[PDB]
Amino acid sequence: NLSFTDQHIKFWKKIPKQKAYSTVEQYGQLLDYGRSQGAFVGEGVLPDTNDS
Amino acid sequence: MLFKYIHDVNAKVEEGRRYLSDVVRVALDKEETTDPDTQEVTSTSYRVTAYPVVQVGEEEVPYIPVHPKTAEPGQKVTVPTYDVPEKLPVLVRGRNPEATGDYDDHIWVTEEVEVRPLVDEVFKEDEFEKARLYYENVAAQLAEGDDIRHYYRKDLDREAGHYSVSRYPSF
């Protein structure tokens, strides 16, 4: 055998494997904790609302 | 009208006698008094007012995105315009003068009432910072989610600690 063997395959053996249950797979991700408004408020004043 | 703030009040506020509309407008404006002969001004003052307003039209304004959104270079959006009305309705209990039985005696009648400003304060040519602080406080207190409750001004008040004058009835 003058060609390569299975010892020359590297990346396929390191990537983790997971089971698929359909042709479309969905996942969610968290991108931010809130828009940068400024958290400094006066005494007795209600802080503004923030959303992630 | 230097500043303009349009706020949306909830159902509890909308049911009050002073708030008979779904939108309250807060504004700060500058006033001048001129001699009749020419434009020679005599005095300048700043006024802070709050009014129940009604919709009277629409206009074209530029679009201002917020952090989770992106806008086109020349995108524009339409917003309504507002104006002070004259009378607003309110329903109160009443009686039918021409009732025929026990099923149409008690009714609800609609009466129109005069509209008055919620806030009306005047500041001199100086102390523009005081007027700005008052405007910001009114806007924030509206944003708190309840009625406008605080109107106290230290400049326009009776001297404290004057026992010979404060002993008279006020209840």
**Rounded CA Rg of chain B:** 23
CA distance B79 to B94: 40
H or E element that contains B133: helix B128-143
| Residue A25, token pair as written in the block | 């797979």
Experimental method: cryo-EM
CA–centroid distance for A33 within its chain: 14
DSSP state string for A5-17 = -GGG--HHHHS--
Cβ-defined contact of B143 to A45 (cutoff 8 Å): no
B144 touches chain A (CB under 8 A): yes
Cβ-defined contact of A35 to B67 (cutoff 8 Å): yes
CA distance B31 to B135: 16
